[PDB]
Amino acid sequence: SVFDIFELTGAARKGSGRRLVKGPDPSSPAFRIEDANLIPPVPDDKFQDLVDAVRTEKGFLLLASLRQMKKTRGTLLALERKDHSGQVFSVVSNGKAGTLDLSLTVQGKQHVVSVEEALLATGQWKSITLFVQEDRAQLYIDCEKMENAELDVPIQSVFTRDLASIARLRIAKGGVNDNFQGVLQNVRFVFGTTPEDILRNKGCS
Ligand SMILES: O=S(=O)(O)N[C@@H]1[C@@H](O)[C@H](O)[C@@H](COS(=O)(=O)O)O[C@@H]1O
């Protein structure tokens, strides 16, 4: 039901691309990104569980706590092709535009949609709940107004059957200048749950 990416990448060893620090959740590890390129990709087999879950739910619920450097574009997660030709999907906290950008590449064509009024790039802690189902995206920042956006294709369109054999899930690393600058905590894919339930359990209402 829950997929904690940092947990899936393995142990945060010395020279692993990240440094253990403190986060809003005191009973869970936080990681300051030092060199995203060094953070290992999620293992193929574990990513396959994610793909299958996404295909079944026709989407997903993505949770993330982030402390991002102001006015920077930071990739939260990305699915990079193994052949190095590019990314098939990515979620970027765009601090320059004040948006959360969702990029999907299907059949060679890249579609990018921005979730407006979403500035998460403040030197302080923010929490997001991203609910994507079909071609619909809903973003909740902490306990604020829900932000919405429509994708050009359904999300399962990206999560093809043999996706884990041609792509790999990377955390904090995206485009050339888009590696996440700051701290991340509890970046997770949650299934069989709704954003409504997670918001209450978080203390909102
Ligand atoms: O410099 S001090 O403020 O004296 N030191 C404070 C402590 O007093 C405080 O309990 C914790 C946690 O604080 S919390 O607000 O995040 O719970 O953070 C710092 O260590």
Curated annotation (Swiss-Prot):
Q: What region holds the Laminin G-like domain?
A: 37-205
Induction context:
Expression is induced by PGE2, S.aureus and lipopolysaccharide. Induced in arteries and lung parenchyma following injury or stress. Expression in vasculature, including arteries, increases in normal aging.
Task: List membrane-spanning regions.
Answer: none
Q: Per the record, which residues fall in region Heparin-binding?
A: 19-67
Q: In which tissues is it expressed?
A: Expressed by platelets (at protein level). Expressed by monocyte-derived immature and mature dendritic cells (at protein level).
Query: What S-S linkages are listed for this chain?
Result: C143-C204
UniProt-annotated location(s): Secreted; Cell surface; Secreted, Extracellular space, Extracellular matrix; Endoplasmic reticulum
Q: What does this protein do?
A: Adhesive glycoprotein that mediates cell-to-cell and cell-to-matrix interactions. Multifunctional, involved in inflammation, angiogenesis, wound healing, reactive oxygen species (ROS) signaling, nitrous oxide (NO) signaling, apoptosis, senescence, aging, cellular self-renewal, stemness, and cardiovascular and metabolic homeostasis. Negatively modulates dendritic cell activation and cytokine release, as part of an autocrine feedback loop, contributing to the resolution of inflammation and immune homeostasis. Ligand for receptor CD47.
**Record-stated family:** Belongs to the thrombospondin family.
Q: How does it assemble?
A: Homotrimer; disulfide-linked. Can bind to fibrinogen, fibronectin, laminin, type V collagen and integrins alpha-V/beta-1, alpha-V/beta-3 and alpha-IIb/beta-3. Binds heparin. Interacts (via the C-terminal domain) with CD47. Interacts (via the TSP type I repeats) with CD36; the interaction conveys an antiangiogenic effect. Interacts (via the TSP type I repeats) with HRG; the interaction blocks the antiangiogenic effect of THBS1 with CD36. Interacts with ATF6 (via lumenal domain).
Q: What's the protein name?
A: Thrombospondin-1
The organism of origin for this protein: Homo sapiens (Human)
Q: Which residues of the full protein are shown?
A: 29 to 233 of 1170
